[PDB]
Amino acid sequence: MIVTVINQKGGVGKTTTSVNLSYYLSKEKKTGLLDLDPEGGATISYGMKRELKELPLGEKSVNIFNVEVFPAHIGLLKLELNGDVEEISNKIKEIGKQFDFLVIDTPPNLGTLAISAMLVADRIVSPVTPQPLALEAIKNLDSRLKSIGKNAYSFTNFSKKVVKLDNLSSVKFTEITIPPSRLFIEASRLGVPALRYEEVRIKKPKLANYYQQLAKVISE
Amino acid sequence: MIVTVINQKGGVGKTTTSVNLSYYLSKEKKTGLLDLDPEGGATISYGMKRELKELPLGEKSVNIFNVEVFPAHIGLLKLELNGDVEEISNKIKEIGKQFDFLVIDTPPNLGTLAISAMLVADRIVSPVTPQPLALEAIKNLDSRLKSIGKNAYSFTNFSKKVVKLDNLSSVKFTEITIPPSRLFIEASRLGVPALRYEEVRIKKPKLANYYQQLAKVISE
Ligand SMILES: Nc1ncnc2c1ncn2[C@@H]1O[C@H](COP(=O)(O)OP(=O)(O)O)[C@@H](O)[C@H]1O
Numbered sequence A, B: 001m002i003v004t005v006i007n008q009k010g011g012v013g014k015t016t017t018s019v020n021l022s023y024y025l026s027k028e029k030k031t032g033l034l035d036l037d038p039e040g041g042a043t044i045s046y047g048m049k050r051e052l053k054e055l056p057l058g059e060k061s062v063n064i065f066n067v068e069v070f071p072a073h074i075g076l077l078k079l080e081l082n083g084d085v086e087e088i089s090n091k092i093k094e095i096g097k098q099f100d101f102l103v104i105d106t107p108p109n110l111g112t113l114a115i116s117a118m119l120v121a122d123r124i125v126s127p128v129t130p131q132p133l134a135l136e137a138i139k140n141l142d143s144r145l146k147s148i149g150k151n152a153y154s155f156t157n158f159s160k161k162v163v164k165l166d167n168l169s170s171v172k173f174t175e176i177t178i179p180p181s182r183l184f185i186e187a188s189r190l191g192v193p194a195l196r197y198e199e200v201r202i203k204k205p206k207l208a209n210y211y212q213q214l215a216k217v218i219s220e
């Protein structure tokens, strides 16, 4: 199953979602994490660096913290500029064939890499926040989803209360809401997944429940 | 400079020393960490797994937490059994040529891999503890060092007080002593270097001083 995480708006928690969902799924599934953002947030979140090499898409991967991570590289930039959407899509499908779950992190846009990941996604996930900018972004994503005949799941981040915009018929907003937590900040400063950091940092871990619910929602 | 960490006695802190010294040196130097222990403690300490592949020595490396780590693999086992010491030594020298510092973690013995790493080491480091078993081990290491015409530095771990056995003329015991700290246990449970974990876990980091002093001692 290919799970593509999408949002025009930066800073909503796309990389956090990709990193921790892939880590959670890896506990029982052969899980891969494909970093399509040239800035490489997920790659850094697994303790690695962006490759200053124009790599072919999906050639290089490392098993870090139980996840097969494909690090970001400067080649993505060229793929963002000259990339042929059909080739990138077929390459992503071929990469996804070798995993039970392939979670894809995307740049903060609906550009070449993001739309290629969307077109072949088995599931599309878009985090949202109560901030007006994120609501506008999810409206635009609903329009694009209709443009490609697909649907997406959404969950709320940075909040105690769920977001549900019923007029976006292509977006299924779940009842999952992730509140602010400095665990995410500390774990991102380490460059480790927040779930794993919590598994040693606090007596009674809590963040795993949200990603369990997200995995259950998309697995249906 | 090739820095080889050596001890017959398991559990003295060899892997901890290798991991954190390489992480500290990486802050300003191109630093590599070669895991020659088939059990792969250092590899796990950088969030990776032992490769169930009979790899050639030094072919595979990943930059994790700023350190170029060569993960352990089952091939080491065969190298422990059939390894030709001259070839392993020359391969280690060739690997070390490409780093400002190459820190080598070794199995808990003086076997093929350990002696090969010792023969080409620019510096040899052996942690010791006040436990009688470790004192016996460092005596034996002094004998072997004389057998190959080399010297080593030693520092004390798991203790508030320095160990200094003046009859071991091939071992320079430093005044460095590392006390018990649950930071090491927590960081090893994450699979991250203890220095990096401390850099986010406590307000005023302390462990970096010991590795600064060790680096200063060996750099002379
Ligand atoms: N629930 C949360 N509570 C606190 N901080 C968070 C939360 N979710 C994400 N963050 C932090 O917000 C920052 C941006 O998140 P990120 O996943 O990089 O957003 P995006 O990938 O959408 O740009 C990161 O430093 C991350 O640690």
Ligand SMILES: Nc1ncnc2c1ncn2[C@@H]1O[C@H](COP(=O)(O)OP(=O)(O)O)[C@@H](O)[C@H]1O
Binding pocket: B007, B009, B010, B011, B012, B013, B014, B015, B016, B017, B041, B108, B157, B158, B178, B179, B180, B181, B182, B184, B185, B188
């Ligand atoms: N100063 C210390 N305080 C507390 N625990 C330590 C200290 N040094 C090492 N340890 C712990 O002891 C265990 C064994 O250390 P390790 O470096 O694996 O020994 P070796 O590699 O010599 O077998 C590890 O779990 C490590 O976290």
Ligand SMILES: [Mg+2]
Binding pocket: A014, A015, A037, A041, A042
């Ligand atoms: Mg991001």
Ligand SMILES: [Mg+2]
Binding pocket: B014, B015, B037, B041, B042
């Ligand atoms: Mg060890």
